Structure formats: structure tokens, C-alpha cells
Design a protein around this ligand. Structure first.
Ligand SMILES: [Mg+2]
Ligand SMILES: [Mg+2]
Ligand SMILES: [Mg+2]
Ligand SMILES: [Mg+2]
Ligand SMILES: [Mg+2]
Ligand SMILES: [Mg+2]
Ligand SMILES: [Mg+2]
Ligand SMILES: [Mg+2]
Ligand SMILES: [Mg+2]
Ligand SMILES: [Mg+2]
Ligand SMILES: [Mg+2]
Ligand SMILES: [Mg+2]
Ligand SMILES: [Mg+2]
Ligand SMILES: [Mg+2]
Ligand SMILES: [Mg+2]
Ligand SMILES: [Mg+2]
Ligand SMILES: [Mg+2]
Ligand SMILES: [Mg+2]
Ligand SMILES: [Mg+2]
Ligand SMILES: [Mg+2]
Ligand SMILES: [Mg+2]
Ligand SMILES: [Mg+2]
Ligand SMILES: [Mg+2]
Ligand SMILES: [Mg+2]
Ligand SMILES: [Mg+2]
Ligand SMILES: [Mg+2]
Ligand SMILES: [Mg+2]
Ligand SMILES: [Mg+2]
Ligand SMILES: [Mg+2]
Ligand SMILES: [Mg+2]
Ligand SMILES: [Mg+2]
Ligand SMILES: [Mg+2]
Ligand SMILES: [Mg+2]
Ligand SMILES: [Mg+2]
Ligand SMILES: [Mg+2]
Ligand SMILES: [Mg+2]
Ligand SMILES: [Mg+2]
Ligand SMILES: [Mg+2]
Ligand SMILES: [Mg+2]
Ligand SMILES: [Mg+2]
Ligand SMILES: [Mg+2]
Ligand SMILES: [Mg+2]
Ligand SMILES: [Mg+2]
Ligand SMILES: [Mg+2]
Ligand SMILES: [Mg+2]
Ligand SMILES: [Mg+2]
Ligand SMILES: [Mg+2]
Ligand SMILES: [Mg+2]
Ligand SMILES: [Mg+2]
Ligand SMILES: [Mg+2]
Ligand SMILES: [Mg+2]
Ligand SMILES: [Mg+2]
Ligand SMILES: [Mg+2]
Ligand SMILES: [Mg+2]
Ligand SMILES: [Mg+2]
Ligand SMILES: [Mg+2]
Ligand SMILES: [Mg+2]
Ligand SMILES: [Mg+2]
Ligand SMILES: [Mg+2]
Ligand SMILES: [Mg+2]
Ligand SMILES: [Mg+2]
Ligand SMILES: [Mg+2]
Ligand SMILES: [Mg+2]
Ligand SMILES: [Mg+2]
Ligand SMILES: [Mg+2]
Ligand SMILES: [Mg+2]
Ligand SMILES: [Mg+2]
Ligand SMILES: [Mg+2]
Ligand SMILES: [Mg+2]
Ligand SMILES: [Mg+2]
Ligand SMILES: [Mg+2]
Ligand SMILES: [Mg+2]
Ligand SMILES: [Mg+2]
Ligand SMILES: [Mg+2]
Ligand SMILES: [Mg+2]
Ligand SMILES: [Mg+2]
Ligand SMILES: [Mg+2]
Ligand SMILES: [Mg+2]
Ligand SMILES: [Mg+2]
Ligand SMILES: [Mg+2]
Ligand SMILES: [Mg+2]
Ligand SMILES: [Mg+2]
Ligand SMILES: [Mg+2]
Ligand SMILES: [Mg+2]
Ligand SMILES: [Mg+2]
Ligand SMILES: [Mg+2]
Ligand SMILES: [Mg+2]
Ligand SMILES: [Mg+2]
Ligand SMILES: [Mg+2]
Ligand SMILES: [Mg+2]
Ligand SMILES: [Mg+2]
Ligand SMILES: [Mg+2]
Ligand SMILES: [Mg+2]
Ligand SMILES: [Mg+2]
Ligand SMILES: [Mg+2]
Ligand SMILES: [Mg+2]
Ligand SMILES: [Mg+2]
Ligand SMILES: [Mg+2]
Ligand SMILES: [Mg+2]
Lengths: 222, 159, 49, 148, 185, 127, 51, 58
RNA sequence: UAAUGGUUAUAUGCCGCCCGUCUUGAAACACGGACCAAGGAGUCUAACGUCUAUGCGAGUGUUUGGGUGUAAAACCCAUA
RNA sequence: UUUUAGUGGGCCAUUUUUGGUAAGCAGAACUGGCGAUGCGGGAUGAACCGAACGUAGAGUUAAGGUGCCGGAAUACACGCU
RNA sequence: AUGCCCUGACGAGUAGGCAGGCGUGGAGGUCAGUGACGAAGCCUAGACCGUAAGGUCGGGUCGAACGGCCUCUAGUGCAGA
């Protein structure tokens, strides 16, 4: 009476319940993303028609990549790179924008490329290079149940729940972002552009704020 | 040879702060210090008794002892690769209260007050401080504000 | 020399002490011979105790 | 145990664990207790404070049997009664038959009052006692007998 | 390359096995390894770690210390568990009814415990009659009462017992130890 | 034949010869690590010899296996040989060097009767 | 034992994200915007084309 | 012969190898340098409080 | 089966300065080294610190001696 | 928390400095390095740029390059000489 | 079950520390081990195993002893002086 035929079926029914919830969550998130972006486009249009200027809300998320190697770093940038968990070259981390962290990003400015990531790059980063931290031990995601086993207390059920909590900086961004292992990115597949990396992007190099060109960069590195 | 006396390199530290020489005002002597209060150290140059060493200028510590005219202050001092507790015997004209411990105590009282109005109704009032946030969406009008500015300026010497 | 927190020792070996080292390898042999002397003396001074 | 020593592990390595710079020498700080007041002063004061100088009055021809006075404490004191008799002597405690403990015959010279004999009367024969030893022995209902 | 924050390949710094080649203690470690893994009682993990410890990390527990622990409120009928030697104590004259599970008992300690009507138990019998450590009281002997710990941290103004072979007048009671000869300490 | 093992990869087939063993007769070819302060071999300058290090170690499935696929077992006699009876797909018998020829005949006969592969069935044979 | 990438491997892209079927069926990645005809103000075009 | 007198080079990296320690505060610090009259009265004020909480519970 | 592979010699391409040593710095126009064999350098002891292991444990230490013995072993033992 | 080795000759670079006409000079301050360290680049080189190293395979790069030696455009473009 | 298996991260190094191993003379035990039908030694751009210290085998030469494992012990490992 080991009840394999009914234990497997009850577990399958629970699996289908969870998948129904995940499906309706993702449909709600897709409608939310679409109405947010169309409302920003229409707000720009309506301000131009009124003669106003629509100023966008300032960006709340940057994606930081350490672009300089390990040797010859001064101790205060070295400490801040460890604190942002950028401990090797082409490491990446999502960063919530506050004053308390925009002054970290000014200290580590010659050693990192950052900017504002789009939904396409967050989606591709988390599907391809997304790893959790589970007793710590760097576990690949590849399953919604293992995401739910550590982030279900925060109401994060699936990988797209994780992506949504990253991109809309929710109340559990800190937990969802510290659960992700720092992204281990390759070199950019086309190159950096820029014959010399270690200038500012404004000055024709790589480091600093490259506000929305970080999407092109990280898609080449991913 | 070399010189490392008690008040060496104190030409400007113990100077008396232009047009504020002479007698010490009396609120300095009527402030009350309890054991555990957090005090700042700034030596008055005009009182030579109870005077802290020059290391302790700008240092902030805790009152552990209260005496006839003086308080004892715990100061943490970085000796080599660790911190040592130093006990200081400073008269109260070299001592002032920290304004940070005022500001934190009105934040404690504000936290208790808003937690009381959250207990009255409306729980989860979100009573931690937050860093400065990125600004939200504005609409900027062009009403008496048509954007009109010229270019960079030519070089002239004006000498 | 003097170095780390150790008790201060008083080992007296600044003479030629190796000229005067007695090791009692003959402990068992001198026991055999003392028992032999007791047996021989007993036989010499029969029945006296 | 010659094969367990690190001499067997320093074979092949030039300096035998002693360094190439400092380069193991004969007696680099002197022999013995040399320079305890000059170059070993910090190892004297810090880890042997009190080492130098004189302390009080000399005793010529001290015999350490004028000073044999081993100390017994009342917290033991019933170990001196053998274990077969200990049970019957502490059960149904009695004056007019109390155990006689010769402390000298067990090899102590003074009784001291560490604490809490039970309330059984005891006749304690001692060369010396302390005051509190006396007070607790008499509070049990016993007596100290002075012997020589 | 990686900017390592922690030291790499760092062992835990904890015994994960006894350093002794005692076959019976290895059998006890096998039993309590099994219990600590399959039971999820914290007692079994604590007993396994205490089974790993060294000799000075397992001080003896006296029977007077056992009896004083049994004079706690609600702890009269608890099984006293000592992971180590139980020694006798002649300074105590009343001994209560007890079950004591220990590695070793001295002859006097075994005699005193079973003469008071109690029982002396090994750790495997403790595991059989209490697999989860139910109704137990773990007792540890005084670690820093050792003679070596007197000399630990010797320095100025420490009061921490110089390492000295012979003791008396003429042995470190002079310059550095009183105001009259130089300075005190 | 032996068990199905993966293809044996040795990672460094070449002998680790000592530095300057080609140069001096008194320097034997047995591996010694350079302990010199200015040794280019110790400092791993390009163009110098490799040093034996743990990354060269064999995969544990194929380690100690011969090209036949058997672990070798040194055998002195029939009683030593018959401790390999149930292991003829993992173990091949090496006959020891100091076994006399007439005992080698006996060992080889027993190993043919038992199916034990013998790595040296040709020593001390009148051939 | 082997990390399979989604955005390759449609099977793993359906194991994660059950909305990946619905997104493709409604096509949702090439969908037409609403065709409005809102026109910017003359003050905007004057400022844009100003010197 | 003349040599290098003094430098503070490498000393902060050595001090941060074990990463400068805060002195591990406790509840109830010592009364080292606390006023002796306050200490004398504190002894009796705690004696009477030990007796007061003894009589409050028993 | 030397067809693939191993080993070896050679050719070719690129790379590769002589080890040991002191030194901030050695290929050095610094020092030892023509070559080979054999020998060749942290040992033993008295006292002792830390740690660990073992025995017993408010005790402990049989071996100075005595008894005994298949005899420098092993075994047993009193007072100190 | 205990215990113990080696070390107690340093040197170079950016920046701030002292003495000196100055020095690959002498002396300090902060950090990074060499010492103690190979690798790619600077022809060459202790320290410069890049990057720090288990053994391999594939891919992408850094710094530096792409007439030929030499892997890679005698590329494209605006001029100057 | 200092076994087997699963998961993750990591790997530069003088002076130095610690660990796990390899080898030599001799000792206790064992393999009722090897051997004049050939022990040991020695030679061998012949073979096999080990990351390595090393270990094993084949052929030649040789003529009396010598190995494995478990422990014990040290006058125990050489390119230099
Ligand atoms: Mg972060
Ligand atoms: Mg966190
Ligand atoms: Mg990376
Ligand atoms: Mg390409
Ligand atoms: Mg480039
Ligand atoms: Mg650059
Ligand atoms: Mg650069
Ligand atoms: Mg001065
Ligand atoms: Mg002055
Ligand atoms: Mg001022
Ligand atoms: Mg005065
Ligand atoms: Mg010291
Ligand atoms: Mg005898
Ligand atoms: Mg004799
Ligand atoms: Mg006689
Ligand atoms: Mg050993
Ligand atoms: Mg060497
Ligand atoms: Mg060696
Ligand atoms: Mg070394
Ligand atoms: Mg050493
Ligand atoms: Mg030397
Ligand atoms: Mg020295
Ligand atoms: Mg030395
Ligand atoms: Mg002098
Ligand atoms: Mg003296
Ligand atoms: Mg005197
Ligand atoms: Mg005198
Ligand atoms: Mg008294
Ligand atoms: Mg331990
Ligand atoms: Mg003691
Ligand atoms: Mg000690
Ligand atoms: Mg003595
Ligand atoms: Mg005295
Ligand atoms: Mg003296
Ligand atoms: Mg090989
Ligand atoms: Mg080799
Ligand atoms: Mg040689
Ligand atoms: Mg060699
Ligand atoms: Mg060496
Ligand atoms: Mg060299
Ligand atoms: Mg060399
Ligand atoms: Mg001179
Ligand atoms: Mg110097
Ligand atoms: Mg400096
Ligand atoms: Mg350091
Ligand atoms: Mg330090
Ligand atoms: Mg053929
Ligand atoms: Mg063939
Ligand atoms: Mg050639
Ligand atoms: Mg060639
Ligand atoms: Mg060639
Ligand atoms: Mg060539
Ligand atoms: Mg070429
Ligand atoms: Mg070349
Ligand atoms: Mg030399
Ligand atoms: Mg020189
Ligand atoms: Mg130089
Ligand atoms: Mg050299
Ligand atoms: Mg030259
Ligand atoms: Mg010369
Ligand atoms: Mg010389
Ligand atoms: Mg030579
Ligand atoms: Mg010469
Ligand atoms: Mg030789
Ligand atoms: Mg030799
Ligand atoms: Mg020599
Ligand atoms: Mg004795
Ligand atoms: Mg005996
Ligand atoms: Mg050490
Ligand atoms: Mg020097
Ligand atoms: Mg200079
Ligand atoms: Mg060097
Ligand atoms: Mg050096
Ligand atoms: Mg480098
Ligand atoms: Mg370059
Ligand atoms: Mg180059
Ligand atoms: Mg050049
Ligand atoms: Mg730079
Ligand atoms: Mg590298
Ligand atoms: Mg070409
Ligand atoms: Mg690595
Ligand atoms: Mg390493
Ligand atoms: Mg090994
Ligand atoms: Mg020998
Ligand atoms: Mg041998
Ligand atoms: Mg023998
Ligand atoms: Mg013959
Ligand atoms: Mg032979
Ligand atoms: Mg021979
Ligand atoms: Mg040859
Ligand atoms: Mg041959
Ligand atoms: Mg012959
Ligand atoms: Mg012969
Ligand atoms: Mg043989
Ligand atoms: Mg020898
Ligand atoms: Mg020798
Ligand atoms: Mg050598
Ligand atoms: Mg050498
Ligand atoms: Mg020679």
C-alpha cells in the first residue's frame, strides 16, 4: 500500500495548480509591462501636444559589470566592488538606485560599466545566466520549484516572478537580488567598440554610465 | 633634536577662536552630564586643568564617571591593529553634548508616536528611513517659460 | 639567549659532565650478584639468619 | 621516532627551515640568561616580573622539617575514617561514642576549616587547628584534642 | 582571477572525528553519527561533538557537581549525561538517586552512584533508552580550572601566574613586583 | 577482455625528467624540484620543462589500468594467483621477476585453467 | 547534470514559463500599436527648429 | 652604514590582515575609575535590592 | 595490423641565457662549480612550555630496592 | 584561545613633499606594486600597460597591433608635412 | 561506512608552517613468501603503473642469499660546502 499511483497523481495535481497560478501571474505581468510602456509613450506624446515636456521618472535599476581585472585596485574601490559582489571581471549585478548606492557607483566608476537594463536584457540574463544562492552553493535555476523553495516567502513563485521583482523594484528586491548569484558574463562577442576600454564612455572608452547602451553591451556579453 | 611634549603641534588647536577670548559663558558650567551620555571633546585653551590630549580633539565618547568639576569619558583609540578603551578625566568646559544623540532621540519618539497611530488603525506604517530616491515623472510647462538660451561664449581676454 | 614565555631553567651542564656520566646498565646484573651474595653468605653462615 | 621529525621533511630544502636571510648561527643573542637587563629586558619584565634584585631576610641552615605542617581541611576529614566504619559512624551520630581521628597518624600537621563536616560528633587529635576548624568541629558536637 | 574576500581552502577548525585510535570510541562515534543524522534531536549532535573533544576539553565531572545539578528545579529525575569521566567526591555525604550516562566512571564514583541506589550507564545504553536525549541533562566540567590556564595571557597588570619552576622568596618577588624594589608590575 | 572503461587519457605521457640531467651525469633523471632562488624552471619561464603537479593526475575510473584494461597484480605462486579467481575482468597477473622457470610453468598453467590474463607469459621460457 | 538554455530549447522554455505558449500563439512580440494621430504643439516645433 | 630610518609603509595592510578589531562591549562595564563614594553607596543599594527581591518572591 | 598509438633519433616552425648562493636587484664583467663514484651536515641527553594520545583519577608514579624468573626480558611487591 | 616559524638590509611607480644646481641622489606621507610572479604587450628590461597561473578543449577578449620580417585591412575617410 | 555517493566553490608563490606519501640500513610479527631449474647487484634510446617521489616486468651479465604487507628503530635520501 505504498500508494505510488495516488501520491504521484496528487503531486501532479498540485503541479498543475502551481502552473495555472504561474500562467495567470505571467499574463498579468505582460499586461502590466505593456500598459506601462504605452502610457509612457502616450505621456510623451500628450505633453508634446500640450506644449509641455514630459520628464520621465528617473531610472530605478542599473546593471553593473566589473570591466577591470583584479590587480592594482585601491582599497576603497576594492571594498565597494566586494560589497557589490563584483569580485572578478565581467561580473554583473543588478543595483537599486538610491543616493546611498549612487555614491558607491561613483567610487567604482573607473572599473565598471553600468547603465539601465531593459526587460529584454533582464529576461535573457536570468534565463541564460541565472543562478540561485541556496546553502550558498550556486544552484542553476532551471525549475520554478527551486525558485519557490527560497523566494516563496516573498511571493516569488517562478522565474518571471523573479524577473518582475528585479525590473519593478519591489519590496523584496533586496532578497530577490541577493538570491541571484552575480552574473558570470563572457567577453562581448563583437568586441567592446572602443580601442581603449579604460576611459569614460563619454570620452570614448567603456567605464561609467552608458545609460541605455548597457543593453547592447550585456547582450554581447551574454 | 625631536620634541614630543604633551601639547606639541597644538598651535592652532588650543587657540581661542577670534573675538571669543576671555571668560567661559555659564551654560557650559550649568549643563548636566549623566553617566552614559555621549559627549564631544573640544579643549578650551583658556582652561589648562582637566585638559584633554590633542589626540582627543574631535573625538566623541560616553560618560562613565561624574565628579566635582569633571566627567570621565570612554574613547576608543586605534592602537596598532585593534581598538583600546581610553578613560579620560576631563573638566566640563572641554566637554559638550552630542547633537546626534538629540536627533536620534526625537527619531525614537517619532517612531513610538507613529507606531501608536498605526496601532490605533492602519498597521504596517513603514517607519524606517529611506535614502534619497530617484525622482518621479514630471510634466514641465512652457508657460512664460519658452526655452531660450544661446551658445558657448567667444574667448576675450578682459585684462 | 632569552626568548618566549617559558620557565627559567637551571640546568648545570657547563662543566665537562660527559666525563662523569654513570648509566646504571648493571642494575639487573648487580641485582643478580646481590642475590648471589645473599645465597653464598647464607650457605657460609648456615643456619644463622 | 626519528622518522616523524621535520628534519626528514626539510631534506632537499636548503636552509632546513631556518631561513636564507637570518641564516642559523651559533648564539646570536648570547648564551643562557645573558643580557636580561640589557637586550632581553622586555622578556624579563613581561613574563618574569620580579626576577632581579633581593627580597627579604636570609635563613642560614634551613631544615625543611621545622616547617612540615601539612594541612587538612574539614571538607575531607572523614576520608581518614576507613570506609567500612564511615557509614556506621555517621549513621546514628553519637556522643559517648564518637570516632577518634588521629590526624598526625595520617600525616597532617594542621586542621583548617574549608567547610561542612556533617553533624556527627568527632574527636579530632591535631597538632594545630585554625579557629574556624575549632568552631565547626565543636558545632558538630565534637572536640579537638591537642597532641604533639 | 578572483578578488577573494575569505581565505581559500580553509578548514573548519573543528574536529570532525576523534584523534584517538580507540575502537570502542569509534563505535560510539558511529552510533551517534547515525543518531545525529537520522533523528534531528539536538542532543545527539551535541553528544557527537563532545565525543570528538580532547582530554583537556573533556574535564572530569564530579559526583558533587552531578548532585548539585540534580538539585535544580524539575531536574531530580533527569538522566545526567557526562561525555567523559565521572570522578568521586568525598566532600559530599548525601548522594541522590540518579541515572548517570558517562564514558568512564572511577571506582569511587561507580561505587557511590550505585550505593545511592542509582545506575551507571554507557552512552550506547543511553542511546537505546533515550534515542532523542529525552529527559537528559548534559554536564560539563570546569575547563579553565586547569593549571595551564593560570599562565595564559601573561603580561603586565594581568595577574596571570608566571611560568616558574621553584617558588618562594628569591623567585620573582623583587624588581617588577613591588614598589620598594623598582616598580610594581 | 576487460571491463568497458572510457578511453584512457594520460594527460602527460612524457617522463618528468630533472632539470640539467641532460647536462650533468651526476644529475640523475629522477624528478627533483628546483629550490633555487633564480631557477627559471621553478619560476615557470616559458620554454622550460613542465613540473609535476596534481592537475596532471589520471581520471579515477581509468587510473592504474593498463592498455589492456586490467589492474596489475604481482603474483609469486599458485596460492597468490588464485586470489584473483573472481576478478579476471579487472585484474591481470604479473609474475614476479624472481620466480624460477619451472614454477612459472605451473603458474601459467593454473592461470590458463582459471582464465587469468598474464601480462608476462614469456619470461624464463626456453624459446 | 547539464544546464539547458531557454531561448534555445523550447522544451525548457515551456518547463519554465507556461505563458511562452500563449505569447507565441497570440504572437505578442510583434503586435500592432493603436494608431492615434496626436500632433505636437507649435511651441515645441519652434523650440526644436530654433537656432 | 646609513639605512632606512622610519616608514609607515605596509603597516595599514598588516593591520587589516586581521582587520582592526572593535573591543567587544558588554552589558555591565567595570567600575574602573568610577567615583568611590558612588561605588560605596552602590554596594549597599544593591545589597538592599537583593534583599527586597528576596522578600518579594521567597 | 605497426594502419592508429607509445618510445626514441632526426628535420622543421616558434620559444628557451648557467645552476647553486648572498642580495632591493644575477645570464652577469659577483662568488663555488673540469668530471665521476663513495662518504658528507638540526643529532643525543638533562630540565622544561604548549598541544595531543593513553592509563588511572583526589589522587598518581611497580622497575632506588626486595621477591621471582624459561634470567639484562617478563611477572609480583612493602615502607618511603 | 593557546602555541610556534620566518622577518626586523628593502626597492620601484603615480600623487603630496624635504635637502640639494642636480642625480638611476639622500630623506618622509598615502596607495599600488616588485621582492615572493609566471603569462600577453612595451624589440630588449625586477617594478610600466593588460592580466595574476591545476591539466586540457572550444569560443571571446584585454593591452598592444594588422606593408614585410609577424598572426591580423598596402582598410575606408578628412586634411597636414 | 578515515567507505561509497551527491552538490557547490576554489587552485600563483620566496622565507616559512602543516599534511599526505615515496625511498634506505636494522628489529618484532606475518605471507607455512622468492631462490643454485638462479637470490642480490649491475647493464639495457625494451615494456607497464604512478602527478611525482618511485614501483613493476622483459632481455643480458651473475652466483647466495633476498622480498611484500603490519608495526618498531635510525649513523635514513646530495650537485654544489
Ligand atoms: Mg549589491
Ligand atoms: Mg543581503
Ligand atoms: Mg565573470
Ligand atoms: Mg570574430
Ligand atoms: Mg584594444
Ligand atoms: Mg585601456
Ligand atoms: Mg588601460
Ligand atoms: Mg613641538
Ligand atoms: Mg602651542
Ligand atoms: Mg581652531
Ligand atoms: Mg598646575
Ligand atoms: Mg614573546
Ligand atoms: Mg628481575
Ligand atoms: Mg654485579
Ligand atoms: Mg647479606
Ligand atoms: Mg607517528
Ligand atoms: Mg635543495
Ligand atoms: Mg624533500
Ligand atoms: Mg619553501
Ligand atoms: Mg623553523
Ligand atoms: Mg644558508
Ligand atoms: Mg636569527
Ligand atoms: Mg634564528
Ligand atoms: Mg647598556
Ligand atoms: Mg637576581
Ligand atoms: Mg633583602
Ligand atoms: Mg638577610
Ligand atoms: Mg580560622
Ligand atoms: Mg578537540
Ligand atoms: Mg596544581
Ligand atoms: Mg602554561
Ligand atoms: Mg621540587
Ligand atoms: Mg614570600
Ligand atoms: Mg634571587
Ligand atoms: Mg607516465
Ligand atoms: Mg617521471
Ligand atoms: Mg651524485
Ligand atoms: Mg635526481
Ligand atoms: Mg628551498
Ligand atoms: Mg634564472
Ligand atoms: Mg639559475
Ligand atoms: Mg661605522
Ligand atoms: Mg633597518
Ligand atoms: Mg609612507
Ligand atoms: Mg601582512
Ligand atoms: Mg599589525
Ligand atoms: Mg602491418
Ligand atoms: Mg603490430
Ligand atoms: Mg633540428
Ligand atoms: Mg627547429
Ligand atoms: Mg629543435
Ligand atoms: Mg627554428
Ligand atoms: Mg616564423
Ligand atoms: Mg629566443
Ligand atoms: Mg656563495
Ligand atoms: Mg649591493
Ligand atoms: Mg636594480
Ligand atoms: Mg643565479
Ligand atoms: Mg656586467
Ligand atoms: Mg671578484
Ligand atoms: Mg663572498
Ligand atoms: Mg658545474
Ligand atoms: Mg672556479
Ligand atoms: Mg658522490
Ligand atoms: Mg652518497
Ligand atoms: Mg658536513
Ligand atoms: Mg613510585
Ligand atoms: Mg612487573
Ligand atoms: Mg609556525
Ligand atoms: Mg641587515
Ligand atoms: Mg631614491
Ligand atoms: Mg630576486
Ligand atoms: Mg630577499
Ligand atoms: Mg605582476
Ligand atoms: Mg601594452
Ligand atoms: Mg613584449
Ligand atoms: Mg622600447
Ligand atoms: Mg592605469
Ligand atoms: Mg593569469
Ligand atoms: Mg601576415
Ligand atoms: Mg582559478
Ligand atoms: Mg599552489
Ligand atoms: Mg602523495
Ligand atoms: Mg644503521
Ligand atoms: Mg628495512
Ligand atoms: Mg630485536
Ligand atoms: Mg645450474
Ligand atoms: Mg638475478
Ligand atoms: Mg654485484
Ligand atoms: Mg644509458
Ligand atoms: Mg640483455
Ligand atoms: Mg663464481
Ligand atoms: Mg660461492
Ligand atoms: Mg628473492
Ligand atoms: Mg649513516
Ligand atoms: Mg648522515
Ligand atoms: Mg640536491
Ligand atoms: Mg643543494
Ligand atoms: Mg663533489
Amino acid at each position: 500500500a505504498e500508494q505510488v499511483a495516488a501520491e504521484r497523481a496528487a503531486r501532479k495535481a498540485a503541479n498543475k495548480e502551481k502552473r495555472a497560478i504561474i500562467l495567470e501571474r505571467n499574463a498579468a505581468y505582460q499586461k502590466e509591462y505593456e500598459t506601462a510602456e504605452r502610457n509612457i509613450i502616450q505621456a510623451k506624446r500628450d505633453a508634446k501636444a500640450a506644449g509641455s515636456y514630459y520628464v520621465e521618472a528617473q531610472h530605478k535599476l542599473v546593471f553593473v559589470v566589473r570591466i577591470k581585472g583584479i590587480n592594482k585596485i585601491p582599497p576603497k574601490p576594492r571594498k565597494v566592488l566586494q560589497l557589490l559582489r563584483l569580485t572578478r571581471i565581467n561580473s554583473g549585478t543588478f543595483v537599486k538606485v538610491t543616493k546611498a548606492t549612487l555614491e558607491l557607483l561613483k567610487l567604482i566608476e573607473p572599473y565598471v560599466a553600468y547603465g539601465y537594463p531593459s526587460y529584454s536584457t533582464i529576461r535573457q540574463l536570468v534565463y541564460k545566466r541565472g543562478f540561485g544562492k541556496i546553502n550558498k552553493q550556486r544552484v542553476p535555476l532551471s525549475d520554478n520549484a527551486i525558485i519557490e523553495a527560497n523566494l516563496g516567502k516573498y511571493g516569488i513563485l517562478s522565474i518571471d516572478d523573479l524577473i518582475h521583482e528585479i525590473i519593478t523594484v519591489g519590496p523584496h528586491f533586496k532578497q530577490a537580488n541577493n538570491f541571484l548569484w552575480p552574473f558570470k558574463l563572457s567577453n562581448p562577442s563583437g568586441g567592446w567598440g572602443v580601442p581603449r576600454k579604460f576611459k569614460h564612455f563619454i570620452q570614448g572608452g567603456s567605464f561609467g554610465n552608458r545609460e541605455e547602451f548597457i543593453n547592447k553591451l550585456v547582450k554581447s556579453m551574454n | 633634536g625631536k620634541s614630543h611634549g604633551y601639547r606639541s603641534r597644538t598651535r592652532y588647536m588650543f587657540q581661542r577662536d577670534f573675538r571669543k577670548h576671555g571668560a567661559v559663558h555659564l551654560s557650559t558650567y550649568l549643563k548636566v552630564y549623566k553617566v552614559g551620555d555621549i559627549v564631544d571633546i573640544k579643549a578650551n585653551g583658556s582652561i589648562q586643568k582637566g585638559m584633554p590630549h590633542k589626540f582627543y580633539q574631535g573625538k566623541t565618547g560616553v560618560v562613565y564617571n561624574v565628579t566635582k568639576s569633571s566627567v570621565g569619558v570612554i574613547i576608543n583609540k586605534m592602537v596598532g591593529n585593534r581598538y583600546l578603551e581610553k578613560r579620560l578625566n576631563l573638566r566640563v568646559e572641554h566637554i559638550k553634548h552630542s547633537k546626534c544623540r538629540q536627533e536620534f532621540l526625537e527619531r525614537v519618539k517619532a517612531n513610538a508616536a507613529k507606531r501608536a497611530e498605526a496601532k490605533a488603525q492602519g498597521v504596517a506604517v513603514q517607519l524606517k528611513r529611506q535614502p534619497a530616491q530617484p525622482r518621479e515623472s514630471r510634466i514641465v510647462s512652457t508657460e512664460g517659460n519658452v526655452p531660450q538660451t544661446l551658445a558657448p561664449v567667444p574667448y576675450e581676454t578682459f585684462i | 639567549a632569552i626568548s618566549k614565555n617559558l620557565p627559567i631553567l637551571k640546568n648545570h651542564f657547563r662543566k665537562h659532565w660527559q666525563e662523569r656520566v654513570k648509566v646504571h646498565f648493571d642494575q639487573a646484573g648487580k641485582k643478580v650478584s646481590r642475590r648471589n651474595a645473599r645465597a653464598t653468605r647464607a650457605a657460609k653462615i648456615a643456619p644463622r639468619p | 621516532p626519528s622518522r616523524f621529525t621535520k628534519t626528514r621533511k626539510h631534506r632537499g630544502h636548503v636552509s632546513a627551515g631556518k631561513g636564507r636571510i637570518g641564516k642559523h648561527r651559533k648564539h646570536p643573542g648570547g648564551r643562557g640568561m645573558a643580557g636580561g637587563q640589557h637586550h632581553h629586558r622586555i622578556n624579563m619584565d613581561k613574563y618574569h616580573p620580579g626576577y632581579f634584585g633581593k627580597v627579604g631576610m636570609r635563613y642560614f641552615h634551613k631544615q625543611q622539617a621545622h616547617f612540615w605542617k601539612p594541612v587538612l581541611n574539614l571538607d575531607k576529614l572523614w576520608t581518614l575514617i576507613p570506609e567500612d566504619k564511615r557509614d556506621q559512624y555517621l549513621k546514628s551520630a553519637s556522643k559517648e561514642t564518637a570516632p577518634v581521628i588521629d590526624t598526625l597518624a595520617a600525616g597532617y600537621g594542621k586542621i583548617l576549616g574549608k567547610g561542612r563536616i556533617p553533624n556527627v560528633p568527632v574527636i579530632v587529635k591535631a597538632r594545630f587547628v585554625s579557629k574556624l576548624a575549632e568552631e565547626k568541629i565543636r558545632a558538630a558536637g565534637g572536640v579537638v584534642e591537642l597532641i604533639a | 582571477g578572483i578578488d577573494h574576500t575569505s581565505k581559500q581552502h580553509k578548514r573548519s577548525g573543528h574536529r570532525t572525528a576523534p584523534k584517538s585510535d580507540n575502537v570502542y570510541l569509534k563505535l560510539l562515534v558511529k552510533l551517534y553519527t547515525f543518531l545525529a543524522r537520522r533523528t534531528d534531536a539536538p542532543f545527539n549532535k551535541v553528544v557527537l561533538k563532545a565525543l570528538f573533544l580532547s582530554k583537556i576539553n573533556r574535564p572530569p565531572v564530579s559526583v558533587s557537581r552531578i548532585a548539585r545539578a540534580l538539585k535544580q528545579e524539575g531536574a531530580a529525575n533527569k538522566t545526567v549525561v557526562v561525555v567523559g569521566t565521572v570522578t568521586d567526591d568525598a566532600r559530599i555525604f548525601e548522594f541522590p538517586k540518579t541515572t548517570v550516562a558517562a564514558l568512564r566512571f572511577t571506582a569511587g564514583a561507580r561505587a557511590k552512584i550505585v550505593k545511592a541506589g542509582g545506575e551507571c550507564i554507557t552512552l550506547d545504553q543511553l542511546a537505546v533508552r533515550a534515542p532523542k536525549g529525552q529527559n537528559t541533562l548534559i554536564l560539563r566540567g570546569p575547563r579553565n580550572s586547569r593549571e595551564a590556564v593560570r599562565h595564559f595571557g601573561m603580561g603586565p597588570h594581568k595577574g596571570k601566574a608566571p611560568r616558574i619552576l621553584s617558588t618562594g622568596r628569591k623567585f620573582e618577588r623583587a624588581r617588577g613586583r613591588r614598589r620598594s624594589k623598582g616598580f610594581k608590575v | 577482455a576487460s571491463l568497458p572503461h572510457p578511453k584512457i587519457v594520460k594527460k602527460h605521457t612524457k617522463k618528468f625528467k630533472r632539470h640539467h640531467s641532460d647536462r650533468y651525469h651526476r644529475v640523475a633523471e629522477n624528478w627533483r624540484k628546483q629550490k633555487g632562488i633564480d631557477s627559471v624552471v621553478r619560476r615557470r619561464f616559458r620554454g622550460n620543462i613542465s613540473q609535476p603537479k596534481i592537475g596532471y593526475g589520471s581520471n579515477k575510473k581509468t587510473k592504474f589500468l593498463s592498455p589492456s584494461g586490467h589492474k596489475t597484480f604481482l603474483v609469486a605462486n599458485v596460492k597468490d594467483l588464485e586470489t584473483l579467481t573472481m576478478h579476471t575482468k579487472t585484474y591481470a597477473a604479473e609474475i614476479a621477476h624472481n620466480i624460477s622457470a619451472k614454477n612459472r610453468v605451473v603458474i601459467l598453467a593454473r592461470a590458463k585453467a582459471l582464465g587469468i590474463k598474464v601480462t608476462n607469459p614469456k619470461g624464463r621460457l626456453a624459446l | 547534470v547539464l544546464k539547458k538554455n531557454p531561448l534555445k530549447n523550447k522544451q525548457v522554455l515551456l518547463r519554465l514559463n507556461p505563458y511562452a505558449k500563449v505569447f507565441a500563439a497570440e504572437k505578442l512580440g510583434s503586435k500592432k500599436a493603436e494608431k492615434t494621430g496626436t500632433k505636437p504643439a507649435a511651441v515645441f516645433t519652434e523650440t526644436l527648429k530654433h537656432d | 652604514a646609513k639605512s632606512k630610518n622610519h616608514t609607515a609603509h605596509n603597516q595599514t595592510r598588516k593591520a587589516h590582515r586581521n582587520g582592526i578589531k572593535k573591543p567587544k562591549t558588554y552589558k555591565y562595564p567595570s567600575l574602573k575609575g568610577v567615583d568611590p563614594k558612588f561605588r560605596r553607596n552602590h554596594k549597599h543599594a544593591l545589597h538592599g535590592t537583593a534583599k527586597a527581591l528576596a522578600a518579594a518572591k521567597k
